[PDB]
Amino acid sequence: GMNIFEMLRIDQGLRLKIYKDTEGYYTIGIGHLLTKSPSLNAAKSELDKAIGRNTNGVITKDEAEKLFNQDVDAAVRGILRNAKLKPVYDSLDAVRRAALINMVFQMGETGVAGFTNSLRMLQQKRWDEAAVNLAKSRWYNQTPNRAKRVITTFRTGTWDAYGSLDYAAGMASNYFHGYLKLSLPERKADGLLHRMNVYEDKYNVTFGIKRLIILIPDEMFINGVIQSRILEKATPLETQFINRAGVNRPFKHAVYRLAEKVNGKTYYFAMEGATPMLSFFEAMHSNFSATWQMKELKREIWLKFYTHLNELIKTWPETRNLVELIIYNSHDTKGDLVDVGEMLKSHMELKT
Amino acid sequence: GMNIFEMLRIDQGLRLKIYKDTEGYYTIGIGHLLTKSPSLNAAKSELDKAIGRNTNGVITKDEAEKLFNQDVDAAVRGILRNAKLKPVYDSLDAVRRAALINMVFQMGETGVAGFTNSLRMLQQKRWDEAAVNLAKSRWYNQTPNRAKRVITTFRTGTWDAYGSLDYAAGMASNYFHGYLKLSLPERKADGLLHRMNVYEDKYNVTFGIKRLIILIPDEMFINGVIQSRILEKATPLETQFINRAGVNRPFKHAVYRLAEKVNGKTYYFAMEGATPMLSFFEAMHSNSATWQMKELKREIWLKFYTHLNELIKTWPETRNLVELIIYNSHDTKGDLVDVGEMLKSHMELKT
Ligand SMILES: Nc1nc2c(ncn2[C@@H]2O[C@@H]3COP(=O)(O)O[C@@H]4[C@H](O)[C@@H](COP(=O)(O)O[C@H]3[C@H]2O)O[C@H]4n2cnc3c(N)ncnc32)c(=O)[nH]1
């Protein structure tokens, strides 16, 4: 997944070979200082003594990880001893503490202690106020890319600002950029709401909610189709064509309708299963044999996919009010398969 | 992102709460025996001694990974002290060493030493012979799934048996299972080759390559289109409809043709860019282009091509249906590369 190592590999960068930092000092891995000597062989001697073998200037990714956590433990020790930094650290969460270790590695302890007013707002949990003040910082001007991510990590307490670099978040990002953000927002005279308005006027029907509903069950659909006792498949929305990767690509959204009246109305729904999860389920079934180890990993990817997808949809105004994510267990507590048509009927009743 | 910890998390399993093994002994993490005492609080105190805090039976993934690396360090010390295992371990690279340590975690140090013939070919770096020899063992019979992944690690020296849940290899897996293998092979009387044969007969044209060409540039298409001075867009292939997660999904392929004849013939090509890389590039540009991210871009870009190419060749339904073209968007001079000249050169070679 995502942790402090992957975060600082983004902001600082990883080097499996010896390099020089901004002050010309020999360094390796993620900002692990070897020596202040201009001698390259003296830097190799310290590198060999730190790992236990004559690496001759090249180390493994695992060895670079075992150097980095030592520097994290050593940086925490100094943070706890520094009187200007320990009260902010003690009241911060681990994700925000990891963000607090981030600027420590970049500018040092004295530089982080310079932001006396921003640390005091983080200590008081005023996440929005210290986000605005770090934007005005000189550290923001020198590194505009890195300042935003540490700010958002302090403001949200999540790994959102570091994009999609693991398997789960990347499935949501490709889902988002390649389909949701691409085809649903109104662009030119076309878009999701436009297609639904043309659909409602053509068939004289009413959509229960004017959003694309995405089903994210923990298990793929039985027989690969949406199984329901009161929901039937209807004519899809008119296909919209969008140039994508050299193809005038057709994008189609399926439409289903309740076979039973709710409040005297037949409700339609533009909806679909979360097909990335289906492609993930299919890929996993071909490589692994459904052990308890895989079920935990599948559910872990399953949850992270929804959380990152829901975060991407909310942060972008073009898609904030266009998608409805429904994540659920395919079986109820009694063990029976959940009827998505019943879920939609109940949702329509709970507001009308 | 795959390593020995994530490998044993696949094969053996990670439990963050104190549990009891097959012999009724309290265990934590990935098979870390805590104590043989029936006292649960004795297991909690022993776990507190190993972690360094009042866990009371529950630990985090980082603590369990740190505890697992200690168990690996102890297993390596035992392997180096074993005269039967030390020579092969010294000769093996880091990845193949993890496959050896995987077996020690499963059957113990004395069990791995019995593979005398098997350890010899590994020491002499005969990977294919060692992979065949290991498949004959009883260890392959009791636990076949775990053995095949360890044997492939000995055979290839990579993490290809386990790394399907990494970003690049995972996006290639979704790209392969959810699109390439889904819609290109021939189902009933439909598929890519059928659409291309219908296309050649309707328009009386000839495809230069009887495959779907997937362009993998290191940079997004300019204005989202394929730029070329000798390629031009033609009528696309007829759209194929496949039911997919409740949607009658359309699968359409664009067709391009060479603007100039190659020995009197105009050659057509079904081709498109790699949509997982386009989304990845779009996401990288939103979250700027420092050297840290430029190396990470090329890293995922390279790993996506290699794992997608492996999946295409592994399955016979797709082995001769896809043509992957990975290339730098600019030459050394800095000029933009015309993808059509690459295809014209491909055509001029055997025609
Ligand atoms: N109802 C509806 N949903 C659509 C349509 N097009 C896409 N979706 C969704 O967007 C996701 C991203 O697809 P992508 O084109 O950006 O790359 C995909 C994906 O990486 C991989 C597996 O697809 P899937 O798991 O179903 O995720 C896709 C889907 O959920 O293969 C790529 N892929 C799938 N189809 C194509 C295609 N025609 N051309 C190129 N790449 C494809 C839609 O039209 N309707």
Author numbering:
A (entry chain B): -14 to 337
B (entry chain A): -14 to 272, 274 to 337
Quote the study on this structure.
Cyclic GMP–AMP synthase (cGAS) is a cytosolic DNA sensor that produces the second messenger cG[2′–5′]pA[3′–5′]p (2′3′-cGAMP) and controls activation of innate immunity in mammalian cells. Here we show that cGAS-like receptors (cGLRs) are innate immune sensors that are capable of recognizing divergent molecular patterns and catalysing synthesis of distinct nucleotide second messenger signals. In support of this conclusion, Hartmann, Imler, Cai and colleagues have identified cGLR2 as a second functional cGLR in Drosophila and have demonstrated in vivo that cGLR1 and cGLR2 have discrete roles in Drosophila immunity. Together, our results define cGLRs as receptors in animal cells that are capable of detecting diverse pathogen-associated molecular patterns and dictating response to the foreign environment.
Drosophila STING (dSTING) is known to function as a cyclic dinucleotide receptor in vivo, but an endogenous nucleotide second messenger has not been previously identified. We therefore developed an in vitro thermo-fluor binding assay to analyse dSTING recognition of specific CDNs. dSTING preferentially formed a thermostable complex with 3′2′-cGAMP and exhibited no detectable complex formation with 2′3′-cGAMP or other CDNs in vitro. To define the mechanism of selective 3′2′-cGAMP recognition, we next determined a 2.0 Å crystal structure of the D. eugracilis STING (GenBank XP_017066673) CDN-binding domain in complex with 3′2′-cGAMP. dSTING adopts a highly conserved V-shaped homodimeric architecture with a deep central pocket that binds to 3′2′-cGAMP. In human STING, high-affinity recognition of 2′3′-cGAMP requires readout of the 2′–5′ phosphodiester linkage by R232 in the β-strand lid. The unique adaptations in the ligand-binding pocket observed in the dSTING–3′2′-cGAMP structure are widely conserved in Diptera and together explain a mechanism for how specific 3′2′-cGAMP-dependent signalling drives the activation of dSTING.
